[PDB]
Amino acid sequence: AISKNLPLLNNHFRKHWQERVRVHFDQAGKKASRRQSRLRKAAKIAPRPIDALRPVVRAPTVKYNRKVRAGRGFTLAELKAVGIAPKYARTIGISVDHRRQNKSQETFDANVARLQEYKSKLVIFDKKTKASEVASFEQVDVSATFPVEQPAPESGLRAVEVPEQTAYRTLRLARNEKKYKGIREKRAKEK
Amino acid sequence: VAENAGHQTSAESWGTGRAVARIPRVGGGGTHRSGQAAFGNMCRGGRMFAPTKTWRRWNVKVNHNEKRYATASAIAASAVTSLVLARGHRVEQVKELPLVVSNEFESVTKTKDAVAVLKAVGAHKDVVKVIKSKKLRAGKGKLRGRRFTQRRGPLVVYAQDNGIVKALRNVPGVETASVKHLGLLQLAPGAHLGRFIIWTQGAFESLDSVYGSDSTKSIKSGYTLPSNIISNTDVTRLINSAEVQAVVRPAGEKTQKKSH
Amino acid sequence: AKISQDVSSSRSKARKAYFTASSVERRVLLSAPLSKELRQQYNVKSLPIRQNDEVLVVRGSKKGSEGKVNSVYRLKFAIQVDKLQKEKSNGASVPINIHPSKVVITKLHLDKDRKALIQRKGGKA
Amino acid sequence: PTRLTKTRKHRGNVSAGKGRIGKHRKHPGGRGKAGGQHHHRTNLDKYHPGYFGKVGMRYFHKQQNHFWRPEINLDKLWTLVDSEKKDEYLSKSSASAAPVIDTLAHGYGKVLGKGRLPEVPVIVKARFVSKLAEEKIRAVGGVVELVA
RNA sequence: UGACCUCAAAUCAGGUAGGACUACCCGCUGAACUUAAGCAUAUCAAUAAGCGGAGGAAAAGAAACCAACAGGGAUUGCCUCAGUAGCGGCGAGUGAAGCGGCAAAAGCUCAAAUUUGAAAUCUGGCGUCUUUGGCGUCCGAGUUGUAAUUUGAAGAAGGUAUCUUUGGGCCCGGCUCUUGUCUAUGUUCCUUGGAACAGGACGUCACAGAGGGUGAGAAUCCCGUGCGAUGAGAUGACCCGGGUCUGUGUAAAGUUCCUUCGACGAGUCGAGUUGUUUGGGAAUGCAGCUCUAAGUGGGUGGUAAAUUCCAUCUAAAGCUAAAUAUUGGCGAGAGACCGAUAGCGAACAAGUACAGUGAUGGAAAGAUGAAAAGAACUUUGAAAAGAGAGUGAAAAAGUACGUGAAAUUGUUGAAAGGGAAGGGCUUGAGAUCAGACUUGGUACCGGGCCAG
RNA sequence: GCCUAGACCGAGGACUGCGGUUUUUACCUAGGAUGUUGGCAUAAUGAUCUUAAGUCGCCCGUCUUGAAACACGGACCAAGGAGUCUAACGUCUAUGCGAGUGUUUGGGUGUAAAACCCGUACGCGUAAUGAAAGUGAACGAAGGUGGGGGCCCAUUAGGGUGCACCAUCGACCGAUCCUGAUGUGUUCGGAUGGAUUUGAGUAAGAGCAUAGCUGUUGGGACCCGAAAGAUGGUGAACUAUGCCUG
RNA sequence: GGCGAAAGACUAAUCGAACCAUCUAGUAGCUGGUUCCUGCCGAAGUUUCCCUCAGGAUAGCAGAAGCUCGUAUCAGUUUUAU
RNA sequence: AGCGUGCUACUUAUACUUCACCGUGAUUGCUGUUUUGACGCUUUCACGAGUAGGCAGGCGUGGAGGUCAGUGACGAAGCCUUUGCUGUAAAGCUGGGUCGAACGGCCUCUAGUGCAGAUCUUGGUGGUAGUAGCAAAUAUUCAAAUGAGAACUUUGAAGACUGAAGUGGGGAAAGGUUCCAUGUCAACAGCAGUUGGACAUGGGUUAGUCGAUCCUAAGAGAUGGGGAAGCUCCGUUUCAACGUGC
Numbered sequence A: 001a002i003s004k005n006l007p008l009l010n011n012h013f014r015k016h017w018q019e020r021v022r023v024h025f026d027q028a029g030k031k032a033s034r035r036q037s038r039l040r041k042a043a044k045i046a047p048r049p050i051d052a053l054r055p056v057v058r059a060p061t062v063k064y065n066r067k068v069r070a071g072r073g074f075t076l077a078e079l080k081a082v083g084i085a086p087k088y089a090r091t092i093g094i095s096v097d098h099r100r101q102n103k104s105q106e107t108f109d110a111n112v113a114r115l116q117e118y119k120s121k122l123v124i125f126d127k128k129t130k131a132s133e134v135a136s137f138e139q140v141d142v143s144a145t146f147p148v149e150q151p152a153p154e155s156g157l158r159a160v161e162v163p164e165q166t167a168y169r170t171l172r173l174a175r176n177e178k179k180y181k182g183i184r185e186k187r188a189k190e191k
Numbered sequence B: 001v002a003e004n005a006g007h008q009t010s011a012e013s014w015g016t017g018r019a020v021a022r023i024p025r026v027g028g029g030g031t032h033r034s035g036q037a038a039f040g041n042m043c044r045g046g047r048m049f050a051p052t053k054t055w056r057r058w059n060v061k062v063n064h065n066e067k068r069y070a071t072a073s074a075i076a077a078s079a080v081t082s083l084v085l086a087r088g089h090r091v092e093q094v095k096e097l098p099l100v101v102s103n104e105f106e107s108v109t110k111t112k113d114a115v116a117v118l119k120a121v122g123a124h125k126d127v128v129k130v131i132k133s134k135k136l137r138a139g140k141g142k143l144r145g146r147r148f149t150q151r152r153g154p155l156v157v158y159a160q161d162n163g164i165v166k167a168l169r170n171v172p173g174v175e176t177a178s179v180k181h182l183g184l185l186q187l188a189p190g191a192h193l194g195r196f197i198i199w200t201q202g203a204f205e206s207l208d209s210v211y212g213s214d215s216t217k218s219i220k221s222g223y224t225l226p227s228n229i230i231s232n233t234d235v236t237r238l239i240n241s242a243e244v245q246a247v248v249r250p251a252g253e254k255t256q257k258k259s260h
Numbered sequence C: 001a002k003i004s005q006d007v008s009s010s011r012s013k014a015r016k017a018y019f020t021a022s023s024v025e026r027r028v029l030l031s032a033p034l035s036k037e038l039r040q041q042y043n044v045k046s047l048p049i050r051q052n053d054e055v056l057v058v059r060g061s062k063k064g065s066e067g068k069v070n071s072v073y074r075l076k077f078a079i080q081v082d083k084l085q086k087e088k089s090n091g092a093s094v095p096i097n098i099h100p101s102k103v104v105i106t107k108l109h110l111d112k113d114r115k116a117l118i119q120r121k122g123g124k125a
Numbered sequence D: 001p002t003r004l005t006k007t008r009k010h011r012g013n014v015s016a017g018k019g020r021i022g023k024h025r026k027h028p029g030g031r032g033k034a035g036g037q038h039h040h041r042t043n044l045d046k047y048h049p050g051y052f053g054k055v056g057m058r059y060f061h062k063q064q065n066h067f068w069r070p071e072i073n074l075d076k077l078w079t080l081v082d083s084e085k086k087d088e089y090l091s092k093s094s095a096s097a098a099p100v101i102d103t104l105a106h107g108y109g110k111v112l113g114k115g116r117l118p119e120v121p122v123i124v125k126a127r128f129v130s131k132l133a134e135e136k137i138r139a140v141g142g143v144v145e146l147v148a
Numbered sequence E: 001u002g003a004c005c006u007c008a009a010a011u012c013a014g015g016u017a018g019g020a021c022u023a024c025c026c027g028c029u030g031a032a033c034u035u036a037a038g039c040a041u042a043u044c045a046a047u048a049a050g051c052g053g054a055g056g057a058a059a060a061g062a063a064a065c066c067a068a069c070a071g072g073g074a075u076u077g078c079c080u081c082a083g084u085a086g087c088g089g090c091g092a093g094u095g096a097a098g099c100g101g102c103a104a105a106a107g108c109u110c111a112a113a114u115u116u117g118a119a120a121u122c123u124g125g126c127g128u129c130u131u132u133g134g135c136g137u138c139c140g141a142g143u144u145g146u147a148a149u150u151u152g153a154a155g156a157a158g159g160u161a162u163c164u165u166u167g168g169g170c171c172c173g174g175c176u177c178u179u180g181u182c183u184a185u186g187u188u189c190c191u192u193g194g195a196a197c198a199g200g201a202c203g204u205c206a207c208a209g210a211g212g213g214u215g216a217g218a219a220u221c222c223c224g225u226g227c228g229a230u231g232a233g234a235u236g237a238c239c240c241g242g243g244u245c246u247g248u249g250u251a252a253a254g255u256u257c258c259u260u261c262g263a264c265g266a267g268u269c270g271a272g273u274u275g276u277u278u279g280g281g282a283a284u285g286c287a288g289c290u291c292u293a294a295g296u297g298g299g300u301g302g303u304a305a306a307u308u309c310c311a312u313c314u315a316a317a318g319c320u321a322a323a324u325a326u327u328g329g330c331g332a333g334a335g336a337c338c339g340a341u342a343g344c345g346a347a348c349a350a351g352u353a354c355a356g357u358g359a360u361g362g363a364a365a366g367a368u369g370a371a372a373a374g375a376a377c378u379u380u381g382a383a384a385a386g387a388g389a390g391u392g393a394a395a396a397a398g399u400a401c402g403u404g405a406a407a408u409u410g411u412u413g414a415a416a417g418g419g420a421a422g423g424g425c426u427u428g429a430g431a432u433c434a435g436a437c438u439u440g441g442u443a444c445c446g447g448g449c450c451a452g
Numbered sequence F: 001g002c003c004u005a006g007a008c009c010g011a012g013g014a015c016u017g018c019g020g021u022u023u024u025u026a027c028c029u030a031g032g033a034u035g036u037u038g039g040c041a042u043a044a045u046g047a048u049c050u051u052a053a054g055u056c057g058c059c060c061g062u063c064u065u066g067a068a069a070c071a072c073g074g075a076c077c078a079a080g081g082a083g084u085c086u087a088a089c090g091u092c093u094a095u096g097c098g099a100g101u102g103u104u105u106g107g108g109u110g111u112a113a114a115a116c117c118c119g120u121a122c123g124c125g126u127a128a129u130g131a132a133a134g135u136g137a138a139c140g141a142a143g144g145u146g147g148g149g150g151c152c153c154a155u156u157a158g159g160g161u162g163c164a165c166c167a168u169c170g171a172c173c174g175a176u177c178c179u180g181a182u183g184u185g186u187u188c189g190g191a192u193g194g195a196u197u198u199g200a201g202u203a204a205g206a207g208c209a210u211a212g213c214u215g216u217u218g219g220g221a222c223c224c225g226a227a228a229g230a231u232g233g234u235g236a237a238c239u240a241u242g243c244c245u246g
Numbered sequence G: 001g002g003c004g005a006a007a008g009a010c011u012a013a014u015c016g017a018a019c020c021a022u023c024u025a026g027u028a029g030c031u032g033g034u035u036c037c038u039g040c041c042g043a044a045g046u047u048u049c050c051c052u053c054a055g056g057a058u059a060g061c062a063g064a065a066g067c068u069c070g071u072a073u074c075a076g077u078u079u080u081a082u
Numbered sequence H: 001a002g003c004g005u006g007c008u009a010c011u012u013a014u015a016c017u018u019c020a021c022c023g024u025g026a027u028u029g030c031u032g033u034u035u036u037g038a039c040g041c042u043u044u045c046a047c048g049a050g051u052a053g054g055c056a057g058g059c060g061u062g063g064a065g066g067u068c069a070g071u072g073a074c075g076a077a078g079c080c081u082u083u084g085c086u087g088u089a090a091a092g093c094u095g096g097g098u099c100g101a102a103c104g105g106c107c108u109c110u111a112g113u114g115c116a117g118a119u120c121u122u123g124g125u126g127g128u129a130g131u132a133g134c135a136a137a138u139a140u141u142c143a144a145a146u147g148a149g150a151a152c153u154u155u156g157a158a159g160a161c162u163g164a165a166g167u168g169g170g171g172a173a174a175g176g177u178u179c180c181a182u183g184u185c186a187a188c189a190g191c192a193g194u195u196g197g198a199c200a201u202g203g204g205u206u207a208g209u210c211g212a213u214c215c216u217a218a219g220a221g222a223u224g225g226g227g228a229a230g231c232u233c234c235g236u237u238u239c240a241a242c243g244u245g246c
C-alpha cells in the first residue's frame, strides 16, 4: 500500500464521488447564451447604459490595502455631497449603499469626483424629448467610461533625507513598545 | 454507455456445487432468460469492461505561444512550392507562390464570378481536383453523418469581406478566412504543411501588422515571431564553403577497399 | 450547406420523416415535373401529381410510354398509369408502379384549386 | 494513446507482466496508508521521517492575509525602477534627486539584503526592511522610508 | 322581550385539500457492506433505503454579516483560497471560511403611534353596468383594532427658504412566440446495365455542392437546402413609439436648515446539562429538559474565567427577479459513440410472451426481389410433394428467402489402414505449379540451366 | 625435401595492396573460379500437396522443488470475453517561453461546442528558518586547495585559463547554547565576539506550461467468485398452533 | 418474528433465522483465467521489520534511460612483504 | 559378447576448426564527386540458451484528419479452394469459383483493438446411438363398414373386468369452452391414427320458488377521540351535543 520514495497523497475519493461529477460540456453554450442575454438586455433599454455607476473603494486586509476596486454603491454622504437623493439616484443609473460609510476623506473625495463626472455626462430625457434626440445618443459602457484606476505609485526623483535613527531600529522600538505597553503601564500605576 | 447498462438484473451467483461456473445468474423461471449469466463483461447482455465515462478528457491544452509558433510555421510553409505540391495541390500552373490577387476579388458577390476569378488566377484545377475526388466514405462513419469524403481546395484569405465569403461558400473544397483569424486546422490540414493559400492584396499587406516584423510590432500583445536555431538553413554550402573547406583534412574513399 | 438551426442533416431523421409521412405530406412528396410545353405554357416547373393527369414516362423500361394517371397510390409512393400493365402467367394484369419523379406531366387535370395553385406559384393558368 | 501502452505488448503472454507466483491481487498490504506503523514502517521511516506525531501549537482560525509579506532583495530592487528611465537614473541620480522605489505598490512587504546595489542613491519605501538591507541602502547614499 | 361570549347543526351560499410524476429542490429519519490489512471511536456518511413538502427552478437573500484594513457591504454560482486552518484510536482518514478575480445584480415590508373633528378599512347578498372588474345599497367582519402615516438607511411632530417631479383607460404599430404561402440550374448525347443515379462528352445554376427519395455513388428528376418576401393568429399592470379620451394635481412626493422626540419583536436572548452533528478544538449548529433576562441594552469578535476598553452589527416578525441545478416532462440540433450475442431489457403486436400465491422476475425475435412479377398450365402421387414449365438480371433469391463460415453430415472421387491417430526431418512415387532461346540481336554470334 | 589418392566449398565483383619472376611500366599460383565440351529448354531442374519407408516425437494450459501423470480445466465449433478511465502525483523524454511562466473562471470575436483575440487576479517559481514571537542570505575577483573537458601559448613534454561535476577546508542566513557595548519606561535593548550543535538554506537564479511511456495512491479499478451484514417490502394455497362453522 | 405434546422441528420442494428488491460490481493476503510476431538483456526463493509464518514493506538480484570521461586505474587470480 | 589389465583402429553432440548466410554489439571511411536516401551507404571484428520480468522493432482490427483527382455493378466487401508468390514471423499480395454495393494503399490521430482454455457467456452441433428404453392396474378375438392406407375408427358378434366404500350416477374447490354438431390430420396424443379433451367453423347455459344476494360466528374494520416526524397505530361506543328517527 505504501511503496517507493513518493509523495504521500490525499486523494479524497472514498465516497460515492462518481454520482457528483460535474463536467462543463456546456461552457461554450453558456458563453453564447450569456452573450445573447447580454445583447437582449442592452437592446431592450438602449440608449440607457446597462451598468449602474459603482464607487471606488479600498480593498480590506493588510494584503490588499494597496489595491483599489469597484465598490457596491455610493454612500449617502457622498450622494449628499453631490446633491442627489438615494431614491432619485437609483433611477438615474447610480448605485446606493446604505451600509458603507466614510471614515476618511480620500475615498469620499474620489467618489464625489466620480459622481460629479458622471453627472456632467448625464442627460435625462423627458416628455418634451423627441426620438431624434434620443437617437442622437449611443449606449456607452459605464464600467469602461468611468474605470477604476489604481493610484500611481510614487516614482521619479526626490531629495534624500536620512534620519539619525534607522528604519530597522524604528521598527524594533515600535515592536518593543507594543509588546511591553501593558506591563509597563501596570508597573507605573502600581508604583 | 448508459450508466446502468448490463446492471438491470437481480442476478445472484448459484455458488459452487451445481457443476456450473460461479458467474451470477438470473433467477425465477418460465422464461429462457432464467438461469442465464449476467453482470460479466464476458456475458451476453452484461456490461462492458470499464464502461466509458463522460468525464474522459476530450479537450487538450496547448500553450498559446507554441500554437502561434505552429501557425507561423504553417504560413511560412504555404510559400514553398515543393511543400504545396507534396500537400497535393494542383499549383503547377501558378507562376509563383505566394499567390496574391487584387482587391476586386474581395467584392465579387456571385459564385460564377468567383469561379471565373479562380480560373483566371490559376487556382481552379485544385477545385476540379476536389470535385473529382468525391467518394463514399468507407466504413460505418457513413451511418454517422460522414457519408462522403473529398480533398481540400485552396484557402482564400481576405482583409475586407464585400461578398467573397458567400461567393465562394458553395464552391467545393474552397475555404475562406479573414487575415485576422488564421489557425492551424486550415493552414496545415491533417498536420500536413503546405496549404494552397490565395491572398488578397489587403490580407497580404495586413500579414505584417498581424504577426509583426523587425520594423513593425505585432498587434498580438507582447508577441514576437520565433527565432530559428540555425541562421543558414542550407548546410551543403556551409560544409562546402571556403571557411570550412580551408581547414579540413583530405577525404578518404567513399568505400573502403577490401584488403583481406 | 444548410444554415438554419431548424434544419436537420440527420439521415435517420430524414428517412423517418419520409417513411412515416402522412398522406397529405405524401401529396407534396409525389411531385412531378411538367414537360417543356406545359412549363412554358404555365410558367410552373413542377406540380404534385394528380389522378387525372396525363404523363410521359422518361426513365426505366417503360420509358417513352404515355398515359393518363389512374391512381396516386400514396401508400406505395407510386402512381399507376392507364395501360402500363404487367401480365402475369395467371393471365391477369397488375398495374406497374412508377415514381412521379420519373415522368413528365404532359396534360394537367385542371380545376379551380389547381388554377389557384398555379397562380400562387408565380405561374399563369 | 493505448497503442503505445505495454498492455498491447502483453497480449499472448499469460500473466500480463504480473508474475505467475505473485498473481496480481486486489490489495495485498492494505489500502492507502495502511500499516504505516506496522508493516510499512520500513518505508515511512526511510522516506518520510517525521510523519507521525505532533509538533508545535495549534492556531484556531488562521487567516493567511495577516502573514502576507513578499520579499524583494537588493540585487532585484532596481528592477522596480522604470526600464525606460533606469540608465538615466543610474547616471544622473544624486542626493538632490534620487529615484523613489515604492516596494509596497509593486507588491512586496519586506526588503531583504541579498546582493549588491549600484553605488547610486535611492529612496526605498517599504513596510519592513532587514538590518543589512537598510545598512546597504544607506551605504550607497540612499534612505529607507517606512510606510504602512 | 333582547344583547354578548363560547360551542354546535344543515344535501345551508360559495370555495379549498387530498392523488400522480422523479432528474434537479426544501426538510425529517437513517443503516450496513466497505476502509482501518483484525476491531469497538472513526470511515463509508450527516450516504442508500423509509417519511413529509414544492417549483420551473427550488432554496438563500437585503447583516444581531465579514473583518481588524487606508476597511468591505443582501443572496447565489464559478475560479482561487486549499487538500490549507483545523478535526482525527492525531491512526486510517478528513476538512471549511474571510480576503481576491469574475457571472448576475434590486430592492424592500410589517409589529411597536390617538383617525379620535367623526373605521376614513374589508368579505358577502341584492340590483345594475362597458364584467380578471366598476357603481349603488343592505347585512356582516371589525374598536380584544380594519385603513392612511413610519421601518432604523430612518422617521415623527412643530417651525422653515422656496424650489424640482407626477394619474388612468382604449387604438395602431415595433419587439417576442407560433403558423400559412411563394423561389435557380440537364433528366442533352454515347457505352455498360433489368434499372443510370455509373463511366465518357457538352453544359447550366450556385447567398442553393446540407440531407432525403427515386429500379446502383443524382447540386442540376422530386422534396428540400440557400436567399429572402409577404399573410394569419396569439401574447406582455409589470417593453417603447406614436395617437386619442379623461387628467377634479390648492393633491402626492422629494429636497435645505432649527428644535423636541425617536415606540424598534420574551419561555425569547442567554446559561447549565443531555444527545446528535460540525473543521469548530474547556463545546460549530440543531434539539430535549432545567433556569431564565436587559435597555446604550443585546449579539458577535474561533482558548475556559473575572476586570477594563475597543470594533461591528441590531436577533427572537415578513417579501423579492437574475446569475445556479436538472439520468424527469415538452420541443430541437448534434457526435472520432454501438451496429441486431452490440446499442436501452426492448430496432419487431417489449415491459410483450412466459414464470411465481405474492412482492417481483422477464426473454427470444431485423434483411426475397427494383417490382410478387409469390410459380398459370401439364404430368406422377391419397396427399404433402416431385418432374416439366413459367416469372425474374439472378430461383447459385421460392417466403424452411441477401451473402450462407465452422462444428457435424450424405454422395462421388482419391488414398491409407495387423491393439489409436496425428507430428518433425529425409528421400522415393503420384498430383499440382513454375521457369530464358530472354522484349535475345544478325545460317551464324552469343546467352540460360544441368552435367563431364 | 619429393611423389601421390579422395571429399566439401567458390563468398567477392573495374583498378588500387603485399610479394614473386623479372627475359618487362611486363607477367604470376601473389587482397575469394575459371576454361572447355556435351545435353536440355513439350523438358533434365526446383517447390508444395498426398502417401510409403527410416528415424525421432507422451497432452496442452496451470499451480509447483518437481506434470505425460493415477493433480486440476478442456466433447466440438462459431460469435463475445479480461490492466481501463479519472483526480492527484515521482522519474525520464519532447516542445514553447524563460526570472518568469500558465490565453480558454471569465470577456471579446466567430464561417458558432471549432478557429482567432484579451487581461486583472490567482497558482507555481524567484528565500529560508523557527513551535512561535520573529529574524532573514558577498571578508575576498561570490573564497582557498587537489582534479577537471575544452580553449590559449607551445614544440615529446611543459605553461596559462579552467565551465559542468567530484573530494575537501572555509564564509553568509535562520534555529539552539554562551558572551553581554553605548543606552534605558531598570527591564528592556542586544553591539561585539564565540560554540565536537542544527535546517528540506545562500554562495551570478531555473522554472512554469502542454504532451508521451513507465510507476504510485483513491476509486467497481485486470476479469469472474464467498460464507455474511444492512434497508424496505411479500408470503400461513404447504405446514405448526388456537379459534368459528360443518 | 411466528408456531412448536420439543425434532432446532415447521413457517409454499426454501429454515441453527423464509422469500423478494435494493445497498452491491459488498470485501477477499485465497482459487481460476488473462488474447499478435520477432529481436536484445535477464532473475528470486536471501537480509531486516511487521498479530509477521499462503501476505507486505525494505535491501539484494534484473531491465531501461542515460551522463562524465577515454587507458585514466580496475580484477571472485597469482607473486613478494607483513 | 564375463572379470582384471595393456594396445591399435574405428563410431559420433546443437561442443571444437574452416567456410557461407541471418541478426545483435562494436568498428573503418564517405561533401570543391553530395550525387534527388547521411534516421543513408560502406570496412572490419566479435558474439547469439532462457522461465518470471524489462525494453526495442514490427504484423493485424474498428473509427478520425490528410493524401492517392486510388479500386468498384465491365463486379466492392465477404466466403471456398494442392493457383501460386513474398516475409524468420505476426501476415501481405495473387489465380479460379461464389457473390452483389461498397472498399482500400500511404502520412498521421484514436481506441470498447488480436483468444484455446477462465466447471468462461450465448447460440449451434456431435460421439454415445437407432442405444437405454417404450414391461404396474387379468384381455382380447372374428367379421362387416369407412377409408389411399385399419392391431388402435365405427357397427355387429363374442370373451372379460370394475362388482353399488364401482372403472356407476352427481356435486364443492379449481379449470374456462375442454360441452355439442360439422369438417378435419401439418403439429400434439413418447407406436399408429380415417379417431381425439388436438386443429378449423359454427351452435349452446332461459328461475319470484335452486343458489348468491340478507344475518350473524371466530374475526375484520371506519367514526368520535388519543398516539406517532410520518407512512400510519390504538380503540369499536370507547371522557361524543352521534335520529339522513318512527
Ligand SMILES: CC[C@H]1CN2CCc3cc(OC)c(OC)cc3[C@@H]2C[C@@H]1C[C@H]1NCCc2cc(O)c(OC)cc21
Residues within 6 Å of the ligand: E021, E329
Ligand atoms: C414511453 C414514453 C412515455 C413515458 N414518459 C415518462 C413519464 C411521463 C410523465 C409525465 O408527467 C409526469 C408526462 O407528461 C407529459 C409524460 C411522461 C412520458 C410520456 C411518454 C409517452 C408520450 N410521449 C410523447 C407523445 C405521446 C403520444 C401518445 O399518443 C401517448 O399515448 C399514451 C404518449 C406520448
Ligand SMILES: [NH3+]CCC[NH2+]CCCC[NH2+]CCC[NH3+]
Residues within 6 Å of the ligand: E045, E046
Ligand atoms: N459524517 C457522518 C459520520 C458521523 N460521525 C460523527 C463524527 C464524530 C467525530 N466528532 C469529532 C470530534 C468532536 N470534535
Ligand SMILES: [Mg+2]
Residues within 6 Å of the ligand: B005, B006, B045, B046, B047, B048
Ligand atoms: Mg449490454
Ligand SMILES: [Mg+2]
Residues within 6 Å of the ligand: B139
Ligand atoms: Mg469493414
Ligand SMILES: [Mg+2]
Residues within 6 Å of the ligand: D016, D017, D018
Ligand atoms: Mg510488470
Ligand SMILES: [Mg+2]
Residues within 6 Å of the ligand: D015, D019, D020, D023
Ligand atoms: Mg495466473
Ligand SMILES: [Mg+2]
Residues within 6 Å of the ligand: D022, D023, D024, D025, D028
Ligand atoms: Mg504480489
Ligand SMILES: [Mg+2]
Residues within 6 Å of the ligand: D038
Ligand atoms: Mg505488532
Ligand SMILES: [Mg+2]
Residues within 6 Å of the ligand: E012
Ligand atoms: Mg351547499
Ligand SMILES: [Mg+2]
Residues within 6 Å of the ligand: E034
Ligand atoms: Mg463500496
Ligand SMILES: [Mg+2]
Residues within 6 Å of the ligand: E036
Ligand atoms: Mg477491516
Ligand SMILES: [Mg+2]
Residues within 6 Å of the ligand: E037
Ligand atoms: Mg481485508
Ligand SMILES: [Mg+2]
Residues within 6 Å of the ligand: none
Ligand atoms: Mg470483519
Ligand SMILES: [Mg+2]
Residues within 6 Å of the ligand: none
Ligand atoms: Mg433516499
Ligand SMILES: [Mg+2]
Residues within 6 Å of the ligand: none
Ligand atoms: Mg408543475
Ligand SMILES: [Mg+2]
Residues within 6 Å of the ligand: none
Ligand atoms: Mg433561472
